[PDB]
Symmetry: D4
Subunit: 119 residues, 8 copies
Amino acid sequence: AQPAAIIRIKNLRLRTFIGIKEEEINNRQDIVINVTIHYPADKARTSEDINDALNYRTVTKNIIQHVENNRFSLLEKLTQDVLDIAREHHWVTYAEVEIDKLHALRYADSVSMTLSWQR
Amino acid sequence: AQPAAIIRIKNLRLRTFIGIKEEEINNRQDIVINVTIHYPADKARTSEDINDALNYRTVTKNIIQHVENNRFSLLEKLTQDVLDIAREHHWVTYAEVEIDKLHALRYADSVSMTLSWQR
Amino acid sequence: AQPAAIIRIKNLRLRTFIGIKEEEINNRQDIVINVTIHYPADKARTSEDINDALNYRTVTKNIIQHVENNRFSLLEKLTQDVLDIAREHHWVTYAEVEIDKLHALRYADSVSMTLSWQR
Amino acid sequence: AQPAAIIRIKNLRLRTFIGIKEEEINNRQDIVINVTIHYPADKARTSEDINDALNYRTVTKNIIQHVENNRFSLLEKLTQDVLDIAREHHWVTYAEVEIDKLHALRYADSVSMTLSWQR
Amino acid sequence: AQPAAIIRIKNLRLRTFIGIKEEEINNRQDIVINVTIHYPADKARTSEDINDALNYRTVTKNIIQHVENNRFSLLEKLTQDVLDIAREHHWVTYAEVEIDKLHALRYADSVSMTLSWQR
Amino acid sequence: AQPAAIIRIKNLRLRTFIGIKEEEINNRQDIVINVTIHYPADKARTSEDINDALNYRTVTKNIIQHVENNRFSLLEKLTQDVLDIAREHHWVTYAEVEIDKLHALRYADSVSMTLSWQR
Amino acid sequence: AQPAAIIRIKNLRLRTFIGIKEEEINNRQDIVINVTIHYPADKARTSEDINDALNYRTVTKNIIQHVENNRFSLLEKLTQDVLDIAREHHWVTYAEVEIDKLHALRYADSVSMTLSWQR
Amino acid sequence: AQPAAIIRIKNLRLRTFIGIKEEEINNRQDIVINVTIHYPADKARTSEDINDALNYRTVTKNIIQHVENNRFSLLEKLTQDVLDIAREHHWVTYAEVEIDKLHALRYADSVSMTLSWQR
């Protein structure tokens, strides 16, 4: 086998302040967050036996909480904060986070920033 | 040449019980399964030539039957169960299974669990 | 640089006979073809400075003509044939062909078969 | 960590002249561009401190300006032109560009050309 | 003003037996139900004060119950059974029900039946 | 009761020759057919039960056969031919037919022609 | 001419509290609002002439402010409040408001409430 | 019968300047035009004998030429202009024009203006 269980939180849609421009700081913007988390496949089947358990519900709760109650200057800062929150649990082997800033550029669907973490 | 034929079963849509919370155990939930199976490309051209053939139809029938006729505690148990069903045939070189649990997280399209197997 | 120009022929939608069952042989089924072709990046810019260039229009023409005017017993035979048609040209470094047999399994969007070739 | 911040400019939809055939040169055709850019993750969190930063807004600006105000003979020339525009900034580690020529083939959604650069 | 509150139950996705042919009676098929119910606008602003109220939840519960736990020979019968269930509440002025039998015709996304009731 | 049962044949996708221009006559084009047919609601609960049943399956079979096995000079002619075929059954009260000529105009999704019949 | 200009505000996506159940009151839900406003077509052109013009921007502003900054007991109250906000201006001849409470019924895409006003 | 042929030009996607604000006048915006035209059904079948015929290709050609080569202050003006170009031909019984101004309001897919003409 390939001992890596992958958890995907697809299209978490939130709104928050990103940017320094008058408008950007005055109105919330639409962003789409996608999180990919890797962790040992054996501990996965163990999810119910032990309570250290990685809870995607908690990861999401935290991300939502942190994003909605803050103002951000750069996409980079935001993407990092969420990455840190995703790889917080000690089972996390690898974690990746992509954030789409919807309609940030005119004539394009979005621009996204993706950051990852190893070990 | 890269001697691996890949079969994908795209968006098998089913309903079953997943969870322990009253609601979860009382109501079936929507899940979407995706199966990726790899096997020797040479034997692929021999699929009406050899009876010990890999039948994606059977694989599907089994999965459906197993999933619709049970109650599961965690996505992990369910995903593994299916992975085992996918990689049951002796030609299976590699097998992957991703299961989306639709609208499990509020404000998110879904959360999915992917597991795989080698050799 | 990474000297490999990738050409993608997206969702070539065709109808043809696939199967041995009475219905399958009596009615054309929908299939979606997706072809990925690689070839040297340098020759790409010089595709118009000679007279034997890779023509995605011809490849497509041949695939259509070959797929619509025939009957196929198995997905694998059909996929291989197309892959052959794809890598026919002497510039092709690599070629991949995925063919979706739409609504082949009930409750599933489709099932596809992928095959590739190197060197 | 995996020191690479990825920036994606998704579906930049533009119209321009591609081809030599009368119709091609008399009427603009629809294209969809997708740009993927990689650069050092550490500098990413330093996008305000270090003022000569990588600006996706500028990259897009140049691409649009360059594409909407020119005529192209081959998809390859155009794709390359954009690729160069993308990897123009000195932080660019890797860059990939895919360009879809919408409805270039009949019976197919589109045909795309993808080109990338390293180091 | 125009004293009619319109409640719409959008895409209620269910599976059941529809048909007489061996296959149709052996495998449940996918159907999508849409329900439109009109009722006095003035009474609408009172469903929190009174308990003789129109509960879209009860309507749904009954439809699901009735459709999943039964077998149907004709779309018309099924559509009528549902129409009666929807207009059962004494507040209902108008009621319309459409039922799509997904992929019932080959080469057509679906075929639907719509029936309505007045007074 | 508003005694009018409505049958909708949704998105019947076919290919056939439309036009007089060389290309139009040399290559089949994609068209999307939508048929709406009205007939008595009372007789509707009767097809298994009562006689000369309106078989949406026979109507479609006839449309497909006639469309695919011919060449048409104008959309209008084609839409009429289908309309006639659709209102051929003696129970038909009303019949409507919209035909999309996919990507007929550049820059637009499609152009359609709608024709209907009464009594 | 048919002297009625129609302004549509399509898919205004907002989140607010709707319901009385513990979960509905503790967590905001996703609703999609659609507004249809009619007014004399002649006055519409005199818009770059007069000052008391109908401003869809202001209407939206008010709808957003009112919806996000409050809690609602029933869909009916929310829809009415919005309807009133929509027909506030003296040019409005007819006003219609549909509100989708996304995934309010399990197994259904949404449930909506539409209300309208005349004169 | 119901002697009214309906021609729909679906989603004509164009870019042009709309508004008075610095940004709006400096950058073209995305608009989607939808045109609906009615004309006598009898004349429709004779749209191949005569040549003073209603040509949807000309209508579209005219629409585009006028839209792309001008600047508009108000949606109302733009929509009227298009409505006029569509009902220009003497066969036109009724004409309708809906214009979506994509992402005009923040938090909404768009805002559209519809205008129609009779006789």
